[PDB]
Design a protein around this ligand. Structure first.
Ligand code: JU6
Ligand code: MG
Ligand code: ZN
Length: 316
């Protein structure tokens, strides 16, 4: 029955193993790419193919047509997680491999392209339901809904308690994509690394490490080849500037990164974001998971490209 194996064209088969892989513009290939990544990083026995495929198409349908936080982002974040898991295969359990690829696919479900801040200022009903990590708690609740549709329980062969464990892996992974939580989590991990107290057999330490892997996967567009990184930056700002428009309509001055009038400062903004967020992220992750080195190196390469843009040597 494991006689039906998923295969990719030669170029994709080789390049999908590299951290900087780009899943391409053919969206009808992204489910196949995802299944392939599950079969190889988990095993062909991890899920029944018919439920997985039905689950994947329900997740796709509950992603929206927004510039950045869309289906392509979900698969892209999932692929970064595949590359981390394939280069660190000894360190993770069967449940974690299983749960972390799904958490990445589902992590921005039903994203409308607005920050937790905008939901709070707009007084969106979701803000009353969840006061912190508003969108992330909605993404997880959307994941549970889909898992609960008929013929969608991809975890049907797990015991009650294993099912509960993997849903807890998934819940914490999706919550950890709230960038507001990342600053505390990374400082804690850094302290624990440099004191030498960090212990991957400690469940609350695993939680923190997985959280950091989630942030690294979520930001992974800063770890692509420069043309990908630069084009993706247009999609991110298209959402930021629409949100800033929406802030102005509420009579609220938007923070600078969401103001389309500060367009010419995008190169300085990116430089800001690389030094304050991205570099520290991939540094701490490489310290803990040495084989994730190419993420840091490609980030450093793109930081150097943004500096190049600031000094007029490149155009954007
Ligand atoms: C938040 C994000 N998330 C990304 C995720 C993936 C890829 C790029 C991503 N870039 C950004 C990003 C983009 C950006 N542009 C800025 N500008 C532009 C022109 C001037 F107004 C300033 C300023 C910032 N400061 C950050 C620093 C960390 O605290 C929050 C704000 N950021 N941050
Ligand atoms: Mg998110
Ligand atoms: Zn995301």
């Amino acid at each position: 029955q494991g006689l039906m194996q998923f295969t990719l064209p030669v170029r994709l088969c080789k390049e999908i193993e590299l951290f900087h892989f780009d899943i391409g513009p053919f969206e009808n290939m992204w489910p196949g790419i995802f299944v392939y990544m599950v079969h190889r990083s988990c095993g062909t026995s991890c899920f029944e193919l018919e439920k997985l495929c039905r689950f994947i198409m329900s997740v796709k349908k509950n992603y929206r047509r927004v510039p950045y936080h869309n289906w392509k982002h979900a698969v892209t974040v999932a692929h970064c997680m595949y590359a981390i898991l394939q280069n660190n295969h000894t360190l993770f359990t069967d449940l974690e491999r299983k749960g972390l690829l799904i958490a990445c696919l589902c992590h921005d479900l039903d994203h409308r392209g607005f920050s937790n801040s905008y939901l709070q200022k707009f007084d969106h009903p979701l803000a009353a339901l969840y006061s912190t990590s508003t969108m992330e708690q909605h993404h997880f609740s959307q994941t549970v809904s889909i898992l609960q549709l008929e013929g969608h329980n991809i975890f049907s062969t797990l015991s009650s308690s294993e099912y509960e464990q993997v849903l807890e892996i998934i819940r914490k992974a999706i919550i950890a994509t709230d960038l507001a939580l990342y600053f505390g989590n990374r400082k804690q991990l850094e302290e624990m690394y440099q004191t030498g107290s960090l212990n991957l057999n400690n469940q609350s330490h695993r939680d923190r490490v997985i959280g950091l892997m989630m942030t690294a996967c979520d930001l992974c567009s800063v770890t692509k080849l420069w043309p990908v990184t630069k084009l993706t930056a247009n999609d991110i700002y298209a959402e930021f500037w629409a949100e800033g428009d929406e802030m102005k309509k509420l009579g609220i001055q938007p923070i600078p990164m969401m103001d389309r009038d500060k367009k010419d400062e995008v190169p300085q903004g990116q430089l800001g974001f690389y030094n304050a967020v991205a570099i520290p992220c991939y540094t701490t992750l490489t310290q803990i998971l040495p084989p994730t080195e190419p993420l840091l190196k490609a980030c450093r390469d793109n930081l150097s490209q943004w500096e190049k843009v600031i000094r007029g040597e490149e155009t954007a």
